[PDB]
Ligand binder design. Structure first.
Ligand SMILES: Nc1nc2c(ncn2[C@@H]2O[C@H](COP(=O)(O)OP(=O)(O)O)[C@@H](O)[C@H]2O)c(=O)[nH]1
Lengths: 422, 70, 176, 141, 38, 131
RNA sequence: AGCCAGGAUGUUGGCUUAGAAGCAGCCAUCAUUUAAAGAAAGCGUAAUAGCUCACUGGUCGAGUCGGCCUGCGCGGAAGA
């Protein structure tokens, strides 16, 4: 990225999309830690919802600095400010609206910046490449300026003298504004809210410059601390700069037939290069490093080099799994992450064909490694395995994963409860 | 919960909702979360932990005696 | 019946025409005519209007009271007129009025357009609320209930046409 | 005058009067803060006793002000630890409300007649007398 | 509604009416108390 | 639950003290709380005595049956709701004016505290007595 | 009948010292206060709530309130 024609240096923003169901919520737990900033998506009409709040808590756990987008301004009943208030009062946040909505469902055309006090008015879904900025649409600037005042109200409290300077009757510049807000936004202070409809392609183009402009960079965000057998205070500061021994963090494991294993990882510190050696410092294992495939407009980008903060996926080695550290033999063995949600709904399971319980057991082995938020059980009553999952759907999209992945049909059932007698 | 089996033992205020203690049987909690999501619009959770054992007249255990025979 | 024992004291400016049994009553709004139950004897009697159960009619007292109520409302219609107030609960449920036809976007598939009866003046102080005005109470109430029945209030979130004073008794969708 | 937002006629053991997550799922929905929740209600209770629920008002202000005049716990309510018997109503006819004496009950009704006032203190005497015998057993003196 | 052969008032809000020679029950409070005949 | 016999009995019992007494007060309370009628009765009893029941008795023949014992020109209290209170400490005492002083503060209405034509007093403060 | 208020201060009655908080844990409770507070019979029930027990209070002023026996009716009551 670089900007909306207003652009400054292409930045490799590294992006991991997020799902919206708490059932597979480890995907939010790890991928909140792996994350530097956070885009709190929102329905401009739906507002905040049982998962907006759920993932908000998820985010709160990693204290991630989050700004919010309000998509779907074209659908009827969508209003940016309302959703803003929804967040502010359902989540207890300080939603500085660094933007504003020009229209609602029928007359949504642009976004009022409260600092440019201008409204870039793109074109629609494909053509929303028109970057014809427009100055102060008075219809909106009747109070867009006073919504800029809210923003200024948040930046003044950013520093001791900055508030006083704001009380000096003086305004703030295009850098002191962001840097004051950012310097703590990096530290998760207030959520900047911009409206748009990525379907209708407005708002999104700005919703990439405020990313660069406020979201912490791995250099703006505080340094992460590793862990060892004994977890120190800073057992190994693994700052962004890959000066540390290669020390990534592997968070996901994937599949490919022509590439084999497709493990994912965000490198916290250090640099591994197309064939190296690292240990499962968390598993006390070891192996080489062959064919990195960093994903950008994915063409099987079999990159021979992955560096600080550069999320990529590795092939081969042996074991890394979802929160397991990626470390050089120097091994800041552990990263604090040894957690994933516990199945809140367990259930017994057995194949359709009775001699497939061994294959459904192994399916559960694979599908248990594939996401950490899905346990497998094997009680001793008869034989039945208990697929302890997060949600009904969380472990029901794996009962069908055996049907899809492992071409086995299964009929689930309640676990047999241990009925002891006396 | 009263409908389920849960015997109320206290409930308070927690933060935004309330934390609610009840030593509900384990049998009575096998999809609870799912039911809970539906009841609360997906906005509540429960944490259950086997504690002890007790009885409820259910010759359902007498039923499962008829296995590989009667 | 007990009501029948109370004269309909005509207001100032109302023109009553006690023609046999059937009677017309003029007022500031208009003229209303009503066919009395044959069991009713009604007179003006100096700005009043009194009802007495005809002889030969055991059910005269109550019928005379029905006449007392029918003629009292008529007076009030011709002088004041009766005004019913309705609401549209439900998103996108809107009931704009175009002269005597209400273009309802109640979100079925189709625009519901209710052509008002002669005598009924519909107003919408809002996209989503009606104010019927008319001379006759029964018929304006009839119109209100007719309208309300198109997209009736509903028992969960009240969505649907409701009277402005309507107390929609709702309930929860389910526990589930 | 603020409306109904923290309405609970409940006073927990007043070592700290009405703890927040101690009460139950009716007082959870009450915005009243804790900074002055037990500042003037943990110390100024010494007018009756410290450790017993202070029958108090639930009047706070919309301006985050909190003003109320706490009345006192009844002598019978104190008659769980103060009048001997920990039991009381429900079976004062099938049980005793305790070895309650009116030589103390009257003295307590006269000296604790501050919160529940009236035209005559004899009125409060009879008030407490009905309060105690509402169980079916009251100090018999 | 119920068309029980025995309509009764189940509520302070239930009411007996004879629209057209038919004995119905109308509970203002319970629409379960809505009965038709008898 | 005022029967005709019991009605004339309670009316007469509450009317004799006012008939042979001094100037007292009554209220006009068709809209008041239990607390208002409890605390006002307690206040009236501390001022004068705990004998006054805060119940209202403005029926169409309570005073037209009790009041006509003496000074019958003082029978103009057949009006709406009335729950009265006595004032033994002097006719038209402080208590005889505190009600009208409190008529707009923590109370609905007080029937203006009409007084009584025991001596046929006119519109003035019935305290023409030097000290 | 209608219409205009009201159904306490112990009052979460201790009331199975979690409250079943004026109306499920359970009993008796006006005890100034009273017409009110029942200290419970649907609303929360965990309270609240506003109606609920009621009661007065007011309004205006003619019958009204209930039951018993009763007569005749009504329904109950669908086949080819
Ligand atoms: N009117 C409007 N429709 C949208 C918007 N965003 C998505 N949609 C549509 O809603 C559907 C889902 O959108 P999308 O974000 O791709 O699906 P997701 O996987 O649930 O997040 C699609 O059919 C979109 O066309 C928007 O901002 N405005």
């Amino acid at each position: 990225w670089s900007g909306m024609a207003k652009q400054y240096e292409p930045h490799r923003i590294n992006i991991i999309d997020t799902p919206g169901h708490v059932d597979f919520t480890i995907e939010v737990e790890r991928s909140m830690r792996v994350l530097d900033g956070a885009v709190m998506v929102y329905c401009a009409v739906g507002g905040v919802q049982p998962q907006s709040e759920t993932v908000w808590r998820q985010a709160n756990k990693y204290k991630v600095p989050r700004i919010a987008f309000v998509n779907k301004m074209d659908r009827m009943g969508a209003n940016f400010l309302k959703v803003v208030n929804q967040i502010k009062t359902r989540l207890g946040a300080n939603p500085v609206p660094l933007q504003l909505a020009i229209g609602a469902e029928e007359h949504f055309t642009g976004v009022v910046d409260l600092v440019k006090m201008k409204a870039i008015n793109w074109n629609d879904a494909d053509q929303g490449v028109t970057f014809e900025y427009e100055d102060i649409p008075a219809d909106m600037v009747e109070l867009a300026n006073e919504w800029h005042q809210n923003l200024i109200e948040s930046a003044a409290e950013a520093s001791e003298e900055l508030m006083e300077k704001y009380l000096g009757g003086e305004e703030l510049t295009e850098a002191e504004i962001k840097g004051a807000l950012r310097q703590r936004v990096l530290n998760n202070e207030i959520i900047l809210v911009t409206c748009g409809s990525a379907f209708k392609n407005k708002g999104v183009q700005a919703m990439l410059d405020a990313v660069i402009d406020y979201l912490p960079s791995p250099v703006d965000v505080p340094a992460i601390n590793g862990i060892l057998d004994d977890g120190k205070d800073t057992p190994a500061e693994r700052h962004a700069s890959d000066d540390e021994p290669f020390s990534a963090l592997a968070f996901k494991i994937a599949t490919d037939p022509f590439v084999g294993n497709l493990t994912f990882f965000r490198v916290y510190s250090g640099v591994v290069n197309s064939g190296d050696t690292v240990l499962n410092s968390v598993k006390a294992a070891r192996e080489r490093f062959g064919r990195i495939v960093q994903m950008h407009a994915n063409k099987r980008e079999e990159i021979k080099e992955v560096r600080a903060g550069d999320i990529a996926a590795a092939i081969g080695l042996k074991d890394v799994t979802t929160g397991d550290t990626l470390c050089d033999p120097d091994a800041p063995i552990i990263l604090e992450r040894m957690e994933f949600p516990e199945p809140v709904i367990s259930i017994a399971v057995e194949p359709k064909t009775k001699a497939d319980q061994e294959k459904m057991g192994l399916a559960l082995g694979r599908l248990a490694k594939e996401d950490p938020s899905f346990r497998v059980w094997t009680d001793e009553e008869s034989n039945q395995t208990i697929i302890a999952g997060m949600g009904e759907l969380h472990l029901d999209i794996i009962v069908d994963r055996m049907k899809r992945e492992f071409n086995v049909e299964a009929n689930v059932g309640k676990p047999q409860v241990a009925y002891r007698e006396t | 919960l009263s409908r389920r089996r849960g015997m109320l033992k206290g409930q308070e205020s927690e933060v935004t909702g309330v934390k609610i203690h009840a030593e509900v049987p384990l049998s009575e909690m096998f999809g609870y979360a799912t039911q809970l999501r539906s009841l609360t619009k997906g906005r509540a959770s429960y944490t259950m932990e086997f504690l002890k054992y007790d009885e409820a007249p259910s010759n359902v255990a007498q039923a499962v005696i008829e296995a590989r025979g009667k | 019946s007990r009501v029948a024992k109370a004269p309909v004291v005509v207001p100032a400016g109302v023109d009553v025409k006690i023609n046999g049994q059937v009677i017309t009553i003029k007022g500031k709004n208009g003229e209303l005519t009503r066919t009395l139950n044959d069991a009713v004897e009604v007179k003006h009697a100096d700005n009043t209007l009194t009802f007495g159960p005809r002889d030969g009619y055991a059910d005269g007292w109550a019928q005379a009271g029905t006449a007392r109520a029918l003629l009292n409302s008529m007076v009030i219609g011709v002088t004041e007129g009766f005004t019913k107030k309705l609401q549209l609960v439900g998103v996108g449920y809107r009931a704009a009025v175009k002269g005597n036809v209400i273009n309802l976007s109640l979100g079925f598939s189709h625009p519901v357009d209710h052509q008002l009866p002669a005598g009924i003046t519909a107003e919408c102080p809002t996209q989503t609320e009606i104010v019927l005005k008319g001379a006759d109470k029964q018929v304006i109430g009839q119109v209100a209930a007719d309208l309300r029945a198109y997209r009736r209030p509903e028992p969960y979130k009240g969505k649907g046409v409701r009277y402005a004073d309507e107390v929609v008794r709702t309930k929860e969708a389910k526990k589930k | 005058a603020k409306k109904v937002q923290a309405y609970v006629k409940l006073q927990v053991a007043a070592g700290m009067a009405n703890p927040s997550p101690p009460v139950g799922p009716a007082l959870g929905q009450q915005g009243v803060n804790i900074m002055e929740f037990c500042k003037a209600f943990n110390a100024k209770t010494d007018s009756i006793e410290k450790g017993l629920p202070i029958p108090v008002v639930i009047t706070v202000y919309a301006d985050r002000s909190f003003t109320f005049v706490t009345k006192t716990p009844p002598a019978a309510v104190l008659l769980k630890k103060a009048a001997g018997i920990k039991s009381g109503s429900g079976k004062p006819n099938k049980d005793k409300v305790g070895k309650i004496s009116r030589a103390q009950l009257q003295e307590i009704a006269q000296t604790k007649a501050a919160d529940m006032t009236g035209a005559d203190i004899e009125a409060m005497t009879r008030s407490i007398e009905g309060t105690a015998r509402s169980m079916g057993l009251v100090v018999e003196d | 509604m119920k068309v029980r052969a025995s309509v009764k008032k189940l509520c302070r809000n239930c009411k007996i009416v004879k629209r057209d020679g038919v004995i119905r029950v109308i509970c203002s409070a319970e629409p379960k108390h809505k009965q038709r005949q008898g | 639950m005022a029967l005709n016999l019991q009605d004339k009995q309670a009316i007469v019992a509450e009317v004799s003290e006012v008939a042979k007494g001094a100037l007292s007060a009554v209220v006009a309370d068709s809209r008041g709380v239990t607390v208002d009628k409890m605390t006002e009765l307690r206040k009236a009893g501390r001022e004068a005595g705990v004998y006054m029941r805060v119940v209202r008795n403005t029926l169409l023949r309570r005073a037209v049956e009790g009041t006509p014992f003496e000074c019958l020109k003082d029978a103009f209290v057949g009006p709406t709701l009335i729950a009265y209170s006595m004032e033994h400490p002097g006719a038209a005492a402080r208590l005889f004016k505190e009600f009208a002083k409190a008529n707009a503060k923590f109370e609905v209405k007080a029937a203006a505290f009409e007084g009584e034509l025991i001596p046929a007093s006119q519109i003035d403060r019935l305290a023409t007595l030097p000290t």
